């Protein structure tokens, strides 16, 4: 279930970061700008950068510790509280991370993987819902 697979993706963090990373801006090719560190790059020149690597691994060990702190997959009001207040995220409303957890849930749904999709997708969502309730536009 959901506290497997925080334990599947930390098993090989740095893998599962990227290829995450990756659908989610390929999908939502419109979030890249986002990144302006890599517009204009492949997914394997993307891959091949240690500084892409470096900075998605930050991020979903963040975003595992979070999820392993989240209660039936509510996330804590003060995790929610650090990822509105963070400088990098000033911009951004919640319908960033809801794009995001829809390129997550279907990563997940075609990895061939037995990971709990429905969770993440509810863990998304109650996500969603505590940023907004902590100051996300
Ligand atoms: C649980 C979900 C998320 C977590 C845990 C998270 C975590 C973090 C962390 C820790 C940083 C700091 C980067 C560093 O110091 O190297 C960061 C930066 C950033 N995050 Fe997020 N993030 C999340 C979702 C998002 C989403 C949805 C977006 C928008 C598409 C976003 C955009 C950014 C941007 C632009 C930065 C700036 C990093 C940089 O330019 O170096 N994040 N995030």
Same mark, same amino acid.
């Given at each position: 279930?959901?506290?497997?697979?925080?334990?599947? &993706?930390?098993? $090989?963090?740095? #893998?599962?970061? +990227?290829?995450?990373?990756?659908?989610? @801006?390929?999908?939502?090719?419109? !979030? /890249?700008?986002?990144?302006?560190?890599?517009?204009?790059?492949?997914?394997?020149?993307?891959?091949?950068?240690?500084?892409?690597?470096?900075?998605?691994?930050?991020?979903?060990?963040?975003?595992?510790?979070?999820?392993?702190?989240?209660?039936?997959?509510?996330? &804590?009001?003060? $995790?929610?509280? #650090?990822?509105? +207040?963070?400088?990098?995220?000033?911009? @951004?409303?919640?319908?960033?991370? !809801? /794009?995001?957890?829809?390129?997550?849930?279907?990563?997940?749904?075609?990895?061939?993987?037995?990971?709990?999709?429905?969770?993440?997708?509810?863990?998304?969502?109650?996500?969603?819902?505590?940023?907004?309730?902590?100051?996300?536009?």
């Amino acid at each position: 279930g959901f506290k497997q697979d925080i334990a599947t &993706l930390r098993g $090989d963090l740095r #893998t599962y970061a +990227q290829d995450i990373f990756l659908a989610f @801006l390929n999908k939502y090719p419109d !979030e /890249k700008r986002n990144f302006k560190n890599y517009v204009g790059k492949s997914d394997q020149e993307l891959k091949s950068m240690a500084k892409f690597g470096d900075h998605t691994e930050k991020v979903f060990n963040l975003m595992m510790e979070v999820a392993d702190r989240a209660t039936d997959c509510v996330p &804590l009001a003060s $995790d929610a509280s #650090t990822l509105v +207040q963070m400088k990098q995220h000033s911009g @951004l409303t919640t319908g960033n991370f !809801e /794009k995001l957890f829809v390129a997550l849930v279907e990563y997940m749904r075609a990895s061939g993987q037995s990971f709990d999709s429905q969770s993440w997708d509810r863990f998304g969502k109650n996500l969603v819902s505590a940023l907004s309730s902590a100051g996300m536009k």
